[PDB]
Amino acid sequence: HYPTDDIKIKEVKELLPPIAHLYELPISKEASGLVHRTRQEISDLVHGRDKRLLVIIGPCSIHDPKAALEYAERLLKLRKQYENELLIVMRVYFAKPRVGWKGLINDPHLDGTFDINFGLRQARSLLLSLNNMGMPASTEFLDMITPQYYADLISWGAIGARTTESQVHRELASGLSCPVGFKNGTDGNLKIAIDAIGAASHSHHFLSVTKAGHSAIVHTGGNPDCHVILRGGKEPNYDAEHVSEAAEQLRAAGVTDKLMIDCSHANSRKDYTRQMEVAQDIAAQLEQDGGNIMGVMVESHLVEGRQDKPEVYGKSITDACIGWGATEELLALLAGANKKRMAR
Amino acid sequence: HYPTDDIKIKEVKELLPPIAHLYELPISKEASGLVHRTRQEISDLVHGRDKRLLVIIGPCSIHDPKAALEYAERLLKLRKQYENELLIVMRVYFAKPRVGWKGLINDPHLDGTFDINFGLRQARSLLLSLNNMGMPASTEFLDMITPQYYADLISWGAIGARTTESQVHRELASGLSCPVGFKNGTDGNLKIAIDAIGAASHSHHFLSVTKAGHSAIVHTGGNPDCHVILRGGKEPNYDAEHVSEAAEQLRAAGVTDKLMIDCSHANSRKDYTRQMEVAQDIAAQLEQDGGNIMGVMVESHLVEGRQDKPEVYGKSITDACIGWGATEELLALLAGANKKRMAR
Amino acid sequence: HYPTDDIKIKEVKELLPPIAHLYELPISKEASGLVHRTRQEISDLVHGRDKRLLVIIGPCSIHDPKAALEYAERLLKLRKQYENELLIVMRVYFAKPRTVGWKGLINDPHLDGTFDINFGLRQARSLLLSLNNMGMPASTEFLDMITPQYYADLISWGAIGARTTESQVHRELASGLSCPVGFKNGTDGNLKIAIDAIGAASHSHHFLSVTKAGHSAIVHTGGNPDCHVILRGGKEPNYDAEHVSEAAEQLRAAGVTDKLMIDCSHANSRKDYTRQMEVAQDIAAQLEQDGGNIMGVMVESHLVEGRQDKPEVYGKSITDACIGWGATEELLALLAGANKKRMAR
Amino acid sequence: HHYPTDDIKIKEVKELLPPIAHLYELPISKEASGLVHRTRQEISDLVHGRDKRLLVIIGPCSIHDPKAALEYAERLLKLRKQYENELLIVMRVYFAKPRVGWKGLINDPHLDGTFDINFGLRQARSLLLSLNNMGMPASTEFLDMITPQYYADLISWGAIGARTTESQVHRELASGLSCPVGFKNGTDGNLKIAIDAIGAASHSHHFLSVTKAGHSAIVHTGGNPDCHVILRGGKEPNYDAEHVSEAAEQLRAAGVTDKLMIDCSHANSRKDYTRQMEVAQDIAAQLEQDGGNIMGVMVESHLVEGRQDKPEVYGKSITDACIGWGATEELLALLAGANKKRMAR
């Protein structure tokens, strides 16, 4: 026999099964309540039963648990203060969808050693600490296996621009315990996200692993808590005209016309200093009408900007983020605007 | 103590591991020769060493292995006849990337019962029978787990238009033993596929299973045999102007400027009779110059058109296909056109 | 670091999990029915509910499935012929507990030294399924804690041999086996170890094995109330009335069942397959006199008598020596006659 | 539906955390690796006659409490260092006796019948890594074919007990253990099973178990050349000079090492801990006269003497009765005394 199997494979190493991580780090009664409740609260937002604004906000990527926990500590205070106008959940994303650093799960030690057992442990550990302190977590799931390791700790999931059209990621979302947001495509196709909600609301089958770590078929029940995310395209799509047009196509498709607006990425034009602009336009809509907005997303860290090496504490090494002060302003701006909308 | 795990899952059933299927249906020496050889031949096309045309052709999707075998039986004689001008490899795709029928792996019995162990068995059996008879096989990998069950029998793989931009599908491609084609986006975005080749040529790490069925981290070494597939979008992109523009961009990104043209899907605009037209243009191109074309894709079946239910034998239940007579003319057209290119 | 792990291991290779084999060879309706029934029928003998004699009879070891099947076709006739007097169940043991040479049909199914265990295990399940489907139940020895997951669903009666009867894990195993189990006395004739094994196996225990899916697992057992002793001699033969009587006394004293099995082969025969008949005559004389403590016998039998080092002749053992088919007819006819009279009392 | 045939007598089969999960949480350290590699080699030297120190396997009958066990180890480690030129001291870290009652530390770590085996295996590995880290090698008995994948990398010396020495699979296991292995004589004093065991264990075999990832597996061994017998009595003790001589003669006749270990406890003490000293005194007299064929002894010792049905008292056995710490010092001072003189010849 000529060889035909694993020709271009350096190594296939066994990973500790999810059950191993769940044994060391069982979810606590407290994290369980914060998760269950935040998910329900978000459901109400998706389906129009509450007019609070869901704010997904935090670092572009997590590369340092200390800074992440310190960021949460400061955010927790504002989560409480604006709890009547805003439902603040923290971005706990472990990589960018990219060339550069491959994320915290792949490369937890920031040196190129790919210790993914440790990476996954750290991600779970972080997510339980956060929930335990009272800060819910959100994340993007890039693949169909990692969710088994910590989705139990996640109160809101994203499927990014580059995966919203992928069948298997829609099948994933259809079984995720948390509400899920589908982003529009990298060039501004909103339809792919609309179809994804359709798909995600039905029952599907996809492949993954059991909690015990073995190949498996997953039969989902459908996810009725999905929604669109406006993150821009060739041009930005945050304004009232783009919101109104999205809302119409949503209704026509017979899915929720309540949606979320990313202030960052292509809606800012990859310029962190324009997130405030977007949030200001969103504030104007809320004060006017803004019936179709249920959430915003905001890339934010202790220190503003980007760096290639993790030199500065609390500075992103993936996309550029606004800093803490700009975070106080933006959140305040949104809370006040939405106080007025809810008051009508 | 609120539940948070698997809230929207009906069932997670463990699957027979790949080793089980590999025990019942080990790759034979002759299939192993055919695959090894065929990957290498295709790799020569991708890199400009051989001017024969790769022809990926066959059903939109396999819904009946018996008819698929009979198809292959007719195709093989054409493979042999045109072996100096065309390298003919059969489409063995088990699903459309969507609605309705979930494909042969999910739903092998065509009634709705989701017998996945059986479907995986049937897919491997069909692929081994095809190789053993001397017909190489091609397919699309939609997830990161199914390759372990039968990628060893695959001479060419596709990442489809809906997944080319997906990070995890790029990582997968980087570790596939076969050469891989990346389709352009559903709206015509060629860049996502050019970036995909760049991405897939490097080492990555993604999650999957071992042959024994255990969750695994897999370290790839890069796939140097990737290329682009022009597939249409808002308008078709098969003509010389589009081919020439794409070649420049490929050169600019420093990747192979030899590409593949799908005669079906958004180039035929879902009209199966127009695939013959696309081939005509392609043939006229090759006759003038056609330096940048290394293959084409055709959707072809025993009988033409499509049907919703599998009533008629060898007739598609997914995208409509040209029938056997049109397939003969198309392949003769392409053989003759490329005979003249090669003779220059 | 210095190394400390796997220092004396040439390789550890993965095996197909039990489910892969149970997928290919699912137990049939009629195989299920035969297994259940037979286990129940044997239980009744263990516990004095029925006076039929269990006869565990067949090759010392299976080295050729085709031979095994032809053997089963002939025995089947007699199983049916003598169904009112004898419960005939075939021996399907895949190795002798050795000590250098052929390591059995599971380990070495090709009989050339390759160790294709995936294949052996499939072949063994395949044979046990075909035997049951034809109306012949099967018996075997389980040497380890993992093999029973592959084919115990096809076994109507199992043995724990002389060399493992005292082993704590083998007793815990037996406590979780679905079939009734016979515990052999020690190689030097020690009966107490088998008496203790009955009491031990009746309780609930825990041991390590694999799930059907092939992963490390803890097995919490329910207890096996259908165990009994097997007299197989040792320093001296223990098939006669006097030995049977001393054993029954010790068994009653421990509060376990005083119904036992007698091996006519191995050390009771002194490794001479022609003495198997003599032992059966003795057992038959006992059954005629009284023999109330006997529920079964064991007999090593094959198409062709004797043994051989290489598998040259069809139907002849390459492990212990067996009586041939003619002698089998005598033996079974003899025991059926002696027990017919017992059951008439 | 079919008649049922599968797991009729099973309460449950719960899947287990795989060895890799414990190996991740508790990886062997560089210093523990050195001690294990070095101690294994030193013991091999003792087995093959290259060093004349006495291997002393000493410690509790069974470990029911790691705190007590760690304290016992700190005390023993002093005498390990003190007597290093005369005795090779290694701690007994047995997790159960091969038995109904308490099922051991691995099976039932919480001593209350809850059977939390993931925790038990976690605890056993932890204690063993802590012992090697403080500088005290560890010995244990392997009762099955699976547990070793969880912590054998931390064992410097292995026992196969009296009740398993004759078992085919246990001998096959032994042939793949990274550590040296002592085989005990049978519960009735049969020495031959142990001598056969050494022979068997020195060759390559194939037995079934699990990969480190927990998957059903076939294990191919390279043989264990470092095996020896352990004399632990029978119907009568077998520690004296005469029994030692006759054993050495049979060992030589079989072509295997005539160097042996004497267990001072169990059937050599007549199951009476007060007699372990008697046995140790005789062995000492032998070492002073000649004692050439003795390479080790086994002593059942704990912080406090005797035993108890329930774990009320700290550092007192709940399995076999042990000598207390005072006696332990007395016994070790004696052996070091006797062997200093033997080594000086």
Ligand SMILES: N[C@@H](Cc1ccccc1)C(=O)O
């Ligand atoms: N555990 C995930 C669902 C899931 C199951 C299996 C595979 C992947 C995802 C959740 O609760 O959301």
Ligand SMILES: N[C@@H](Cc1ccccc1)C(=O)O
């Ligand atoms: N076995 C695949 C590569 C692969 C390994 C593991 C997971 C996914 C893909 C091949 O030969 O192409």
Ligand SMILES: N[C@@H](Cc1ccccc1)C(=O)O
């Ligand atoms: N499946 C075996 C019992 C068993 C379970 C698990 C391990 C070993 C044996 C039977 O039914 O007899």
Ligand SMILES: N[C@@H](Cc1ccccc1)C(=O)O
């Ligand atoms: N890991 C054991 C050997 C072993 C392997 C596999 C199963 C059982 C035992 C050792 O180092 O000694």
Ligand SMILES: [Mn+2]
């Ligand atoms: Mn970002």
Ligand SMILES: [Mn+2]
């Ligand atoms: Mn198609």
Ligand SMILES: [Mn+2]
């Ligand atoms: Mn025999």
Ligand SMILES: [Mn+2]
């Ligand atoms: Mn003891």
